[PDB]
Amino acid sequence: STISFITWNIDGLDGCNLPERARGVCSCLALYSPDVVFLQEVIPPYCAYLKKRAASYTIITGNEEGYFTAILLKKGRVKFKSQEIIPFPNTKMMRNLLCVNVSLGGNEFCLMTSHLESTREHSAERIRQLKTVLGKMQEAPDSTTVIFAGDTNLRDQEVIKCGGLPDNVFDAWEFLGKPKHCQYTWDTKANNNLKHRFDRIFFRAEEGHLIPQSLDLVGLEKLDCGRFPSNHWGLLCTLNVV
């Protein structure tokens, strides 16, 4: 069998053309119809829009106020089991780690998402948050297939200086041979709502039991307002399970 998901910073902090942009994101999710969707910078009015225009998804939120992440689960495809929110005690931007354990097909999954600390100046905090994510991915059982996806805000080659990913934590984009057609999810040249690889995918699993098959960008079509659904590109990923 196979699985598919979309990670995307829908950018709820941009208060302009938000209803139209929300309809844009939902139209995109409807085309690909992923099993899971990892959202970042979601806000309550934006969240209330997903409960209507993306009714075929079970919404789990990282918070109830301000802005927050979210994990959507395709009904009839993904079965919810439990959720958990690992906090970031020293976050200055209400960031955290949303965890949602599910049963997809016939395998146990640990779906994770987070919006790591933004800006260059808060590099140290972003790294410490990353280590927490990586550490949390280790806490899961070996039978469980852990998949993290979200806005990591990682830049300036911050990863390789912190020690790099653990031996058992693999980057999907790197696993697929570092394709350039979806390298940059953040691009001020292409996008004009306003380049780095902020949005990333980390996964841990038994050897061969999770093989990334493809990775693509989404939300690259302008809407009626002449703007894109978000300042970030979305990332569609499909994986095989054996």
PDB file of N, CA and C in Angstrom, residues 9 13 40-41 67 93 95 114-127 129-130 148 150-159 185-186 196-200 202 231-232:
ATOM      1  N   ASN A   9       2.783  25.772   5.120  1.00  0.00           N
ATOM      2  CA  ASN A   9       2.584  26.963   5.936  1.00  0.00           C
ATOM      3  C   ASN A   9       1.609  27.894   5.222  1.00  0.00           C
ATOM      4  N   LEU A  13      -0.923  34.589   9.275  1.00  0.00           N
ATOM      5  CA  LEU A  13      -0.506  35.876   9.822  1.00  0.00           C
ATOM      6  C   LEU A  13      -0.604  36.989   8.782  1.00  0.00           C
ATOM      7  N   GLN A  40       0.680  24.880   9.139  1.00  0.00           N
ATOM      8  CA  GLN A  40       1.326  25.804  10.069  1.00  0.00           C
ATOM      9  C   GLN A  40       0.757  27.209   9.887  1.00  0.00           C
ATOM     10  N   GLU A  41       0.910  28.041  10.914  1.00  0.00           N
ATOM     11  CA  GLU A  41       0.354  29.394  10.923  1.00  0.00           C
ATOM     12  C   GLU A  41      -1.148  29.386  10.642  1.00  0.00           C
ATOM     13  N   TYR A  67      -1.961  31.958  16.646  1.00  0.00           N
ATOM     14  CA  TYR A  67      -1.736  31.129  15.468  1.00  0.00           C
ATOM     15  C   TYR A  67      -1.049  29.836  15.891  1.00  0.00           C
ATOM     16  N   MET A  93       7.204  32.569  20.605  1.00  0.00           N
ATOM     17  CA  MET A  93       6.278  32.682  19.484  1.00  0.00           C
ATOM     18  C   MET A  93       5.198  31.603  19.545  1.00  0.00           C
ATOM     19  N   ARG A  95       5.304  28.480  19.850  1.00  0.00           N
ATOM     20  CA  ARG A  95       5.584  27.300  19.041  1.00  0.00           C
ATOM     21  C   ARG A  95       5.621  26.049  19.909  1.00  0.00           C
ATOM     22  N   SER A 114       5.409  20.879  13.444  1.00  0.00           N
ATOM     23  CA  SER A 114       5.799  22.007  14.277  1.00  0.00           C
ATOM     24  C   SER A 114       6.237  23.190  13.425  1.00  0.00           C
ATOM     25  N   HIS A 115       6.094  24.383  13.990  1.00  0.00           N
ATOM     26  CA  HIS A 115       6.527  25.617  13.347  1.00  0.00           C
ATOM     27  C   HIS A 115       7.688  26.192  14.149  1.00  0.00           C
ATOM     28  N   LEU A 116       8.897  25.719  13.863  1.00  0.00           N
ATOM     29  CA  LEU A 116      10.066  26.082  14.657  1.00  0.00           C
ATOM     30  C   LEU A 116      10.281  27.593  14.677  1.00  0.00           C
ATOM     31  N   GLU A 117      10.997  28.060  15.696  1.00  0.00           N
ATOM     32  CA  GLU A 117      11.200  29.487  15.930  1.00  0.00           C
ATOM     33  C   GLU A 117      11.713  30.191  14.678  1.00  0.00           C
ATOM     34  N   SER A 118      11.072  31.302  14.329  1.00  0.00           N
ATOM     35  CA  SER A 118      11.391  32.028  13.104  1.00  0.00           C
ATOM     36  C   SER A 118      12.570  32.980  13.289  1.00  0.00           C
ATOM     37  N   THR A 119      12.946  33.652  12.202  1.00  0.00           N
ATOM     38  CA  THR A 119      13.997  34.674  12.200  1.00  0.00           C
ATOM     39  C   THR A 119      15.397  34.088  12.376  1.00  0.00           C
ATOM     40  N   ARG A 120      16.394  34.820  11.889  1.00  0.00           N
ATOM     41  CA  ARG A 120      17.788  34.399  11.987  1.00  0.00           C
ATOM     42  C   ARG A 120      18.311  34.568  13.408  1.00  0.00           C
ATOM     43  N   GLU A 121      17.825  35.603  14.087  1.00  0.00           N
ATOM     44  CA  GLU A 121      18.337  35.981  15.401  1.00  0.00           C
ATOM     45  C   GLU A 121      18.056  34.912  16.452  1.00  0.00           C
ATOM     46  N   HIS A 122      16.971  34.165  16.261  1.00  0.00           N
ATOM     47  CA  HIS A 122      16.592  33.104  17.187  1.00  0.00           C
ATOM     48  C   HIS A 122      17.029  31.745  16.655  1.00  0.00           C
ATOM     49  N   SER A 123      18.271  31.680  16.184  1.00  0.00           N
ATOM     50  CA  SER A 123      18.828  30.444  15.653  1.00  0.00           C
ATOM     51  C   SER A 123      18.989  29.397  16.748  1.00  0.00           C
ATOM     52  N   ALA A 124      19.559  29.809  17.876  1.00  0.00           N
ATOM     53  CA  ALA A 124      19.824  28.900  18.987  1.00  0.00           C
ATOM     54  C   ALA A 124      18.553  28.202  19.463  1.00  0.00           C
ATOM     55  N   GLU A 125      17.476  28.968  19.608  1.00  0.00           N
ATOM     56  CA  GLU A 125      16.204  28.417  20.058  1.00  0.00           C
ATOM     57  C   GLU A 125      15.656  27.423  19.041  1.00  0.00           C
ATOM     58  N   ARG A 126      15.790  27.758  17.761  1.00  0.00           N
ATOM     59  CA  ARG A 126      15.303  26.901  16.687  1.00  0.00           C
ATOM     60  C   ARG A 126      16.004  25.544  16.700  1.00  0.00           C
ATOM     61  N   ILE A 127      17.304  25.548  16.980  1.00  0.00           N
ATOM     62  CA  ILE A 127      18.077  24.310  17.042  1.00  0.00           C
ATOM     63  C   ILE A 127      17.633  23.456  18.227  1.00  0.00           C
ATOM     64  N   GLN A 129      14.837  23.451  19.661  1.00  0.00           N
ATOM     65  CA  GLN A 129      13.517  22.936  19.325  1.00  0.00           C
ATOM     66  C   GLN A 129      13.638  21.751  18.375  1.00  0.00           C
ATOM     67  N   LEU A 130      14.568  21.844  17.430  1.00  0.00           N
ATOM     68  CA  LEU A 130      14.791  20.767  16.472  1.00  0.00           C
ATOM     69  C   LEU A 130      15.244  19.500  17.188  1.00  0.00           C
ATOM     70  N   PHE A 148       7.644  13.278  10.623  1.00  0.00           N
ATOM     71  CA  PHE A 148       7.562  14.700  10.934  1.00  0.00           C
ATOM     72  C   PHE A 148       7.537  15.528   9.656  1.00  0.00           C
ATOM     73  N   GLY A 150       6.820  19.936   8.601  1.00  0.00           N
ATOM     74  CA  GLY A 150       6.406  21.275   8.972  1.00  0.00           C
ATOM     75  C   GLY A 150       7.450  22.325   8.652  1.00  0.00           C
ATOM     76  N   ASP A 151       7.153  23.569   9.016  1.00  0.00           N
ATOM     77  CA  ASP A 151       8.066  24.683   8.786  1.00  0.00           C
ATOM     78  C   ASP A 151       9.179  24.671   9.829  1.00  0.00           C
ATOM     79  N   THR A 152      10.380  24.299   9.398  1.00  0.00           N
ATOM     80  CA  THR A 152      11.516  24.163  10.304  1.00  0.00           C
ATOM     81  C   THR A 152      12.312  25.461  10.433  1.00  0.00           C
ATOM     82  N   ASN A 153      12.095  26.391   9.504  1.00  0.00           N
ATOM     83  CA  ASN A 153      12.798  27.675   9.508  1.00  0.00           C
ATOM     84  C   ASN A 153      14.322  27.516   9.519  1.00  0.00           C
ATOM     85  N   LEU A 154      14.800  26.343   9.119  1.00  0.00           N
ATOM     86  CA  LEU A 154      16.232  26.061   9.119  1.00  0.00           C
ATOM     87  C   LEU A 154      16.914  26.735   7.935  1.00  0.00           C
ATOM     88  N   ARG A 155      17.981  27.475   8.222  1.00  0.00           N
ATOM     89  CA  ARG A 155      18.667  28.271   7.210  1.00  0.00           C
ATOM     90  C   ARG A 155      20.155  28.369   7.517  1.00  0.00           C
ATOM     91  N   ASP A 156      20.900  29.011   6.620  1.00  0.00           N
ATOM     92  CA  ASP A 156      22.330  29.247   6.813  1.00  0.00           C
ATOM     93  C   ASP A 156      23.095  27.957   7.104  1.00  0.00           C
ATOM     94  N   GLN A 157      22.603  26.847   6.561  1.00  0.00           N
ATOM     95  CA  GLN A 157      23.214  25.537   6.771  1.00  0.00           C
ATOM     96  C   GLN A 157      23.281  25.200   8.258  1.00  0.00           C
ATOM     97  N   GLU A 158      22.209  25.517   8.977  1.00  0.00           N
ATOM     98  CA  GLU A 158      22.158  25.350  10.428  1.00  0.00           C
ATOM     99  C   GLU A 158      22.228  23.891  10.876  1.00  0.00           C
ATOM    100  N   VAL A 159      21.756  22.984  10.028  1.00  0.00           N
ATOM    101  CA  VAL A 159      21.670  21.572  10.388  1.00  0.00           C
ATOM    102  C   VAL A 159      23.050  20.942  10.560  1.00  0.00           C
ATOM    103  N   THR A 185      10.920  25.810  -0.948  1.00  0.00           N
ATOM    104  CA  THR A 185       9.505  26.028  -0.671  1.00  0.00           C
ATOM    105  C   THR A 185       9.263  27.505  -0.382  1.00  0.00           C
ATOM    106  N   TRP A 186      10.338  28.195  -0.014  1.00  0.00           N
ATOM    107  CA  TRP A 186      10.317  29.628   0.250  1.00  0.00           C
ATOM    108  C   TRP A 186      11.089  30.347  -0.852  1.00  0.00           C
ATOM    109  N   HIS A 196      15.124  29.658   0.734  1.00  0.00           N
ATOM    110  CA  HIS A 196      15.588  28.619   1.650  1.00  0.00           C
ATOM    111  C   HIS A 196      14.682  27.391   1.599  1.00  0.00           C
ATOM    112  N   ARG A 197      15.129  26.315   2.241  1.00  0.00           N
ATOM    113  CA  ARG A 197      14.338  25.094   2.362  1.00  0.00           C
ATOM    114  C   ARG A 197      13.779  24.986   3.778  1.00  0.00           C
ATOM    115  N   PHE A 198      12.820  25.851   4.093  1.00  0.00           N
ATOM    116  CA  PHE A 198      12.224  25.891   5.423  1.00  0.00           C
ATOM    117  C   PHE A 198      11.378  24.653   5.708  1.00  0.00           C
ATOM    118  N   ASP A 199      10.466  24.329   4.797  1.00  0.00           N
ATOM    119  CA  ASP A 199       9.587  23.182   4.986  1.00  0.00           C
ATOM    120  C   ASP A 199      10.317  21.890   4.641  1.00  0.00           C
ATOM    121  N   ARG A 200      10.381  20.976   5.605  1.00  0.00           N
ATOM    122  CA  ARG A 200      11.115  19.726   5.440  1.00  0.00           C
ATOM    123  C   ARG A 200      10.334  18.538   5.984  1.00  0.00           C
ATOM    124  N   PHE A 202      10.994  14.815   7.955  1.00  0.00           N
ATOM    125  CA  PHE A 202      11.833  13.840   8.642  1.00  0.00           C
ATOM    126  C   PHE A 202      11.010  12.593   8.934  1.00  0.00           C
ATOM    127  N   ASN A 231       2.640  32.609   1.166  1.00  0.00           N
ATOM    128  CA  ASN A 231       3.999  33.015   0.827  1.00  0.00           C
ATOM    129  C   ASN A 231       4.929  31.806   0.749  1.00  0.00           C
ATOM    130  N   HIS A 232       4.496  30.698   1.344  1.00  0.00           N
ATOM    131  CA  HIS A 232       5.212  29.429   1.252  1.00  0.00           C
ATOM    132  C   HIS A 232       4.614  28.547   0.165  1.00  0.00           C
TER     133      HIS A 232
END
